[PDB]
Design a protein around this ligand. Structure first.
Ligand SMILES: CC(C)=CCC/C(C)=C/CC/C(C)=C/CONC(=O)CP(=O)(O)O
Ligand SMILES: [Zn+2]
Lengths: 323, 5, 407
């Protein structure tokens, strides 16, 4: 009825329809800590929320009161719980509640409670028809909203709405090929649909990634993805990769390409390859170049890697102490 | 800023 | 040398660490360049003002900020009216790190307040009369342990706490954050943290939990909120720390994890980002860098011989430089990045992260790195609970005298 920001908004202690209720002051104790000096409006709404909660008054007025309490602090999970209790007891129209949550998330999209509330509504209605579009609108304002992506994965997974997501992913990667959330969504969609074992798919993905890497050699997301989809089977399992990466050494170098090379060498020395020494030195050479020039912020990591490789792949690594 | 809960 | 710059972020070569957008601009590169430009200004402000750089942790200012906030807050904190135990914890821990005593007048008033936040059914709520929730429960327990008095310990109703944890446990191994609430890796960590400290861990409380957490590790090497989600420092800290408490760190691919977190430190800024291709932020000085002490203990537990015995696997100096030069508010308190306003959350974690970067300790081995003036050194923090290492020992020892609820 009366909006919290309305110019003619009135405190609850000045509302006739609330005269029967005695507000309940916050019980902070004799000598409080981290006591918040709430504004009049805030303390007033909550003093009355505390009253209805305490009486467990499940009424239309209590329902409207939770809207204001939520508006004052959308992170108050206790108010959200009571509101859901009211939604059921009062048999409130859930689509109307959906319209409401849609609006609240639009204004406070980084809050945990609002997304969980929307999920509960979808679960109750067993209707995901509005989700992908709603989420898309939120993602259009912040393409990396964590809660939005999490809700999207949940919706897609629970109702099996995989059909158009890869298309959605391509669209966003086009807008910003650096969006790690979208690279994650790509891995989400594919591994749950075709999988990465189908050689035709894996082939496609690697070509796509290398292609994105050529267009933006310093975009760390493409590199992490390329590594993420090949590391489980073993990088050494793909002999052409190593070479093809060296072909970018001149015109597309980055600390990322250098780092990948080390990962390939690493796995190669793991699956005992040919010239188990020519590879090792090639690796320590890169590890040093990174720890001292191309990627010093990670010097402590690169020295550890160079050390680990030497500690188990040097020609002396399998040789007795007495020899 | 950031949120934890 | 005389021409040699002792500060990593000011060295001429550092300029090469600026972002290379390959002439391909997207929202991401643009935002990243904006931040670097602002951070560069901070770095070279000494040069332009013709002054000698000096890194000072404004202890006095932070103390005043914290001392007052522990008692009273402006309406700016209305958005945290359901996170008051968090406020108690962030502040008390900051004071602890700064090595400031906690008057018994305060300690006892904190105890009584948290008592009021405790639910009749177990666990703590975000405030008096609020339903119990694992985040404020975690904060409350940590706060009481930092105080470490018999009184603080006795506030915690161990029987009900356990009952509460069970009421949230799911069949798949995960926990709800609160009744009728959401599920993500934070709950596993909050539960493990309070259960282990108060000694209420039963044989089946965490069955399947290690497995569920392990499912959150993704293709990136890091851990996401729930299975399938992007890797994030906040959830990764929760996941690994919980697994460490449960002694199941091995359930994860520690190698891919180590590579992911070390890649989260920004080459230019020196601080950490929360996820790949996003912005640096002071609170990750703890959530991300705090992982390294955990990985060190996990790998060393596996007999990893290549483990350094003096430093963590992240640029300790660069992190300290970022925090000290870019994350302090002149009026006291710390923050996300230059241009952001202070708050107790960032004050707590920027300091926790600074401590981690200053103190290395792998058993008998002990090496410190204190950038700037020596007064900058803070008290150490436990990498799992993020409270004094002594408070942890003292607390667990105290509760180990009690019997696990129900025996
Ligand atoms: C013990 C607890 C409660 C740990 C949680 C620590 C964190 C930091 C959780 C973060 C959750 C999250 C990713 C929320 C989404 O909003 N965050 C951002 O967008 C910040 P960024 O851009 O740095 O990822
Ligand atoms: Zn932050």
């Amino acid at each position: 009825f009366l909006s919290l920001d309305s110019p003619t908004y009135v405190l609850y202690r000045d509302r006739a329809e609330w005269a029967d209720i005695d507000p309940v002051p916050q019980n902070d104790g004799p000598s409080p800590v981290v006591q918040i000096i709430y504004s009049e409006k805030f303390r007033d709404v909550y003093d009355y929320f505390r009253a209805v909660l305490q009486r467990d008054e499940r009424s239309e007025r209590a329902f409207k009161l939770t809207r204001d309490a939520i508006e004052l602090n959308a992170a108050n999970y206790t108010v959200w719980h009571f509101r859901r209790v009211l939604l059921r007891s009062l048999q409130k129209d859930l689509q109307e509640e959906m319209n409401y949550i849609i609006a609240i998330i639009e204004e406070q999209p980084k809050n945990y409670q609002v997304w969980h509330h929307r999920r509960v509504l979808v679960e109750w209605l067993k209707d995901p028809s509005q989700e992908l579009e709603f989420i898309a609108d939120i993602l259009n304002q912040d393409a990396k909203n964590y809660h939005a992506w999490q809700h999207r994965q949940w919706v897609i997974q629970e109702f099996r709405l995989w059909d158009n997501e890869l298309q959605y992913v391509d669209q966003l990667l086009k807008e910003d090929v650096r969006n790690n959330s979208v690279w994650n969504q790509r891995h989400f969609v594919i591994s749950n649909t075709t999988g990465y074992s189908d050689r035709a798919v894996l082939e496609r993905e690697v070509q796509y990634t290398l292609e994105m890497i050529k267009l933006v050699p310093h975009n760390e997301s493409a590199w992490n993805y390329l590594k993420g989809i090949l590391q489980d089977r073993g990088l050494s399992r793909y002999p052409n990769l190593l070479n093809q990466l060296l072909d970018l050494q001149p015109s597309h170098s980055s600390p990322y390409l250098i780092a990948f090379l080390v990962d390939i060498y690493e796995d190669m020395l793991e699956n005992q390859c040919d010239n188990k020494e020519d590879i090792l030195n090639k690796a320590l050479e890169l590890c040093e170049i990174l720890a001292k020039e191309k990627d010093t912020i990670r010097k402590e990591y690169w020295r550890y890697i160079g050390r680990s490789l030497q500690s188990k792949h040097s020609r002396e690594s399998d040789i007795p102490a007495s020899v | 800023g950031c949120v934890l809960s | 040398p005389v021409w040699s710059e002792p500060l990593y972020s000011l060295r001429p070569e550092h300029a090469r660490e600026r972002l290379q957008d390959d002439s391909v601009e997207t929202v991401t590169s643009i935002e990243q360049a904006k931040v670097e430009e602002k951070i560069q200004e901070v770095f070279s402000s000494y040069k332009f003002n013709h002054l000698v750089p000096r890194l000072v942790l404004q202890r006095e200012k932070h103390f005043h900020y914290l001392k007052r906030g522990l008692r009273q807050l402006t309406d700016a904190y209305e958005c945290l009216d359901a996170s008051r135990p968090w406020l108690c914890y962030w502040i008390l821990h900051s004071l602890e790190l700064l090595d400031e005593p906690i008057p018994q007048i305060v300690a006892t008033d904190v105890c009584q307040f948290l008592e009021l936040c405790q639910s009749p059914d177990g666990g703590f709520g975000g405030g008096p009369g609020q339903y119990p929730h694992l985040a404020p429960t975690y904060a409350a327990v940590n706060a009481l342990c930092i105080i470490g008095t018999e009184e603080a310990y006795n506030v915690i109703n161990r029987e009900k706490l356990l009952q509460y944890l069970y009421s949230l446990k799911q069949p798949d191994g995960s926990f709800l954050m609160h009744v009728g609430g959401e599920v993500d890796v934070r709950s596993a960590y909050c539960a493990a943290s309070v259960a282990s400290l108060t000694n209420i861990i039963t044989p089946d409380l965490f069955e399947g939990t290690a497995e569920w957490i392990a499912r959150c590790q993704n293709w990136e090497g890091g851990i996401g909120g729930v299975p399938g989600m992007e890797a994030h420092g906040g959830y990764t800290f929760c996941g690994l720390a919980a697994l460490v408490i449960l002694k199941k760190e091995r359930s994860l691919n520690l190698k891919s994890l180590l590579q992911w977190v070390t890649s989260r430190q920004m080459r230019f800024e020196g601080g950490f980002q929360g996820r790949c291709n996003k912005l640096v932020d002071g609170c990750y000085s703890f959530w991300q860098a705090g992982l390294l002490p955990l990985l060190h203990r996990a790998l060393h537990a596996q007999g990893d011989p290549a483990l350094s015995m003096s430093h963590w696997m992240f640029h300790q100096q660069a992190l300290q430089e970022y925090i000290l030069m870019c994350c302090q508010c002149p009026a006291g308190g710390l923050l996300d990045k230059p241009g952001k306003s202070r708050d107790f959350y960032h004050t707590c974690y920027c300091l926790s992260g600074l401590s981690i970067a200053q103190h290395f300790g792998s058993g008998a081995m002990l090496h410190d790195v204190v950038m700037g003036v020596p007064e900058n050194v803070l008290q150490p923090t436990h990498p799992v609970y993020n409270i004094g290492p002594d408070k942890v020992i003292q607390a667990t020892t105290h509760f180990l005298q009690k019997p696990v609820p129900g025996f």
